[PDB]
Design a protein around this motif. Structure first.
Motif, PDB file in Angstrom:
ATOM      1  N   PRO A  57      64.768  11.336  18.133  1.00 41.61           N
ATOM      2  CA  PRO A  57      64.947  11.933  16.820  1.00 41.61           C
ATOM      3  C   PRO A  57      63.752  11.637  15.917  1.00 41.61           C
ATOM      4  N   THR A  58      63.503  12.490  14.987  1.00 43.31           N
ATOM      5  CA  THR A  58      62.419  12.301  14.069  1.00 43.31           C
ATOM      6  C   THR A  58      62.875  12.734  12.683  1.00 43.31           C
ATOM      7  N   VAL A  59      62.473  12.012  11.667  1.00 45.83           N
ATOM      8  CA  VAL A  59      62.846  12.363  10.316  1.00 45.83           C
ATOM      9  C   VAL A  59      61.654  12.917   9.558  1.00 45.83           C
ATOM     10  N   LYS A  60      61.860  14.029   8.909  1.00 46.03           N
ATOM     11  CA  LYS A  60      60.851  14.639   8.067  1.00 46.03           C
ATOM     12  C   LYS A  60      61.253  14.372   6.637  1.00 46.03           C
ATOM     13  N   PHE A  61      60.431  13.679   5.912  1.00 52.49           N
ATOM     14  CA  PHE A  61      60.767  13.284   4.559  1.00 52.49           C
ATOM     15  C   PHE A  61      60.449  14.358   3.553  1.00 52.49           C
ATOM     16  N   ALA A  62      60.897  14.114   2.331  1.00 46.94           N
ATOM     17  CA  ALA A  62      60.673  14.971   1.170  1.00 46.94           C
ATOM     18  C   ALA A  62      59.189  15.088   0.810  1.00 46.94           C
ATOM     19  N   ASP A  63      58.366  14.262   1.430  1.00 40.64           N
ATOM     20  CA  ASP A  63      56.934  14.307   1.205  1.00 40.64           C
ATOM     21  C   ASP A  63      56.260  15.181   2.256  1.00 40.64           C
ATOM     22  N   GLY A  64      56.989  15.507   3.312  1.00 42.96           N
ATOM     23  CA  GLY A  64      56.448  16.344   4.359  1.00 42.96           C
ATOM     24  C   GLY A  64      56.055  15.580   5.621  1.00 42.96           C
ATOM     25  N   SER A  65      55.828  14.284   5.513  1.00 46.64           N
ATOM     26  CA  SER A  65      55.460  13.504   6.676  1.00 46.64           C
ATOM     27  C   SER A  65      56.701  13.046   7.433  1.00 46.64           C
ATOM     28  N   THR A  66      56.511  12.686   8.667  1.00 47.96           N
ATOM     29  CA  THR A  66      57.575  12.278   9.522  1.00 47.96           C
ATOM     30  C   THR A  66      57.474  10.819   9.893  1.00 47.96           C
ATOM     31  N   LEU A  67      58.532  10.312  10.440  1.00 49.18           N
ATOM     32  CA  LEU A  67      58.547   9.034  11.102  1.00 49.18           C
ATOM     33  C   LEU A  67      59.376   9.207  12.348  1.00 49.18           C
ATOM     34  N   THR A  68      58.743   9.035  13.481  1.00 46.60           N
ATOM     35  CA  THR A  68      59.389   9.110  14.765  1.00 46.60           C
ATOM     36  C   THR A  68      60.433   7.990  14.820  1.00 46.60           C
ATOM     37  N   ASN A  69      61.615   8.311  15.394  1.00 47.51           N
ATOM     38  CA  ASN A  69      62.873   7.489  15.390  1.00 47.51           C
ATOM     39  C   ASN A  69      62.757   6.101  14.749  1.00 47.51           C
ATOM     40  N   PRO A  70      62.978   6.061  13.436  1.00 48.20           N
ATOM     41  CA  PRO A  70      62.979   4.855  12.658  1.00 48.20           C
ATOM     42  C   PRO A  70      64.390   4.335  12.415  1.00 48.20           C
ATOM     43  N   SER A  71      64.475   3.121  12.003  1.00 48.90           N
ATOM     44  CA  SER A  71      65.730   2.521  11.688  1.00 48.90           C
ATOM     45  C   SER A  71      66.015   2.764  10.192  1.00 48.90           C
ATOM     46  N   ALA A  72      67.221   2.441   9.733  1.00 48.72           N
ATOM     47  CA  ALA A  72      67.629   2.678   8.347  1.00 48.72           C
ATOM     48  C   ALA A  72      66.726   1.944   7.368  1.00 48.72           C
ATOM     49  N   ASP A  73      66.342   0.732   7.712  1.00 48.81           N
ATOM     50  CA  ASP A  73      65.455  -0.082   6.855  1.00 48.81           C
ATOM     51  C   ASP A  73      64.132   0.611   6.647  1.00 48.81           C
ATOM     52  N   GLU A  74      63.568   1.072   7.749  1.00 53.37           N
ATOM     53  CA  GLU A  74      62.269   1.721   7.775  1.00 53.37           C
ATOM     54  C   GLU A  74      62.273   3.002   6.940  1.00 53.37           C
ATOM     55  N   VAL A  75      63.336   3.786   7.060  1.00 56.82           N
ATOM     56  CA  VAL A  75      63.443   5.014   6.288  1.00 56.82           C
ATOM     57  C   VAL A  75      63.712   4.760   4.806  1.00 56.82           C
ATOM     58  N   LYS A  76      64.578   3.778   4.497  1.00 61.67           N
ATOM     59  CA  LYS A  76      64.878   3.399   3.101  1.00 61.67           C
ATOM     60  C   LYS A  76      63.614   2.998   2.391  1.00 61.67           C
ATOM     61  N   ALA A  77      62.808   2.220   3.091  1.00 67.55           N
ATOM     62  CA  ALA A  77      61.557   1.702   2.576  1.00 67.55           C
ATOM     63  C   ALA A  77      60.611   2.816   2.162  1.00 67.55           C
ATOM     64  N   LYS A  78      60.600   3.901   2.918  1.00 72.30           N
ATOM     65  CA  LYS A  78      59.705   4.983   2.606  1.00 72.30           C
ATOM     66  C   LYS A  78      60.324   5.889   1.547  1.00 72.30           C
ATOM     67  N   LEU A  79      61.566   6.287   1.801  1.00 75.64           N
ATOM     68  CA  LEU A  79      62.304   7.248   0.981  1.00 75.64           C
ATOM     69  C   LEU A  79      62.387   6.839  -0.488  1.00 75.64           C
ATOM     70  N   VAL A  80      62.586   5.552  -0.729  1.00 74.71           N
ATOM     71  CA  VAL A  80      62.700   5.034  -2.081  1.00 74.71           C
ATOM     72  C   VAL A  80      61.426   5.331  -2.904  1.00 74.71           C
ATOM     73  N   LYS A  81      60.260   5.205  -2.278  1.00 70.74           N
ATOM     74  CA  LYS A  81      58.991   5.375  -2.977  1.00 70.74           C
ATOM     75  C   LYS A  81      58.744   6.847  -3.290  1.00 70.74           C
ATOM     76  N   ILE A  82      59.322   7.715  -2.474  1.00 71.15           N
ATOM     77  CA  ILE A  82      59.167   9.152  -2.634  1.00 71.15           C
ATOM     78  C   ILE A  82      60.019   9.632  -3.798  1.00 71.15           C
ATOM     79  N   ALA A  83      61.245   9.159  -3.842  1.00 69.21           N
ATOM     80  CA  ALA A  83      62.186   9.591  -4.853  1.00 69.21           C
ATOM     81  C   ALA A  83      61.904   8.958  -6.204  1.00 69.21           C
ATOM     82  N   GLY A  84      61.703   7.664  -6.219  1.00 67.72           N
ATOM     83  CA  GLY A  84      61.498   6.971  -7.455  1.00 67.72           C
ATOM     84  C   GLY A  84      62.323   5.751  -7.479  1.00 67.72           C
ATOM     85  N   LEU A  85      63.046   5.556  -8.573  1.00 67.57           N
ATOM     86  CA  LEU A  85      64.050   4.489  -8.712  1.00 67.57           C
ATOM     87  C   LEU A  85      63.446   3.074  -8.805  1.00 67.57           C
TER      88      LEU A  85
END
Length: 88
Positions: A57-85
């Protein structure tokens, strides 16, 4: 709009699909999913950013880049910076 936080590209017959779903759900991560063998363009995309070939599986983020099969921690870490908060 950050409504499309991350798009999950996976097959139903993947091993990591349900594994990762649970990890995201436990972290209340909002995601969008589309099957790759239905969406040929997505399949092509995920197969290119995958580990060699279409398997994981691969996730494509709101920024357009992907991360090949990451764990929840790894995705949270990236996603938070994209969204804000994480700021004042």
């Amino acid at each position: 709009m950050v409504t499309a936080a991350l798009t999950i590209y996976t097959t139903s017959w993947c091993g990591y699909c349900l594994r990762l779903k649970t990890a995201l759900t436990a972290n209340r991560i909002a995601y969008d999913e589309v099957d790759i063998e239905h969406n040929r363009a997505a399949a092509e995309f995920v197969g290119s950013v995958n580990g060699g070939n279409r398997t994981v599986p691969t996730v494509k983020f709101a920024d357009g880049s992907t991360l090949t099969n990451p764990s929840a921690d790894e995705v949270k870490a990236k996603l938070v910076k994209i969204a804000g908060l994480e700021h004042h």
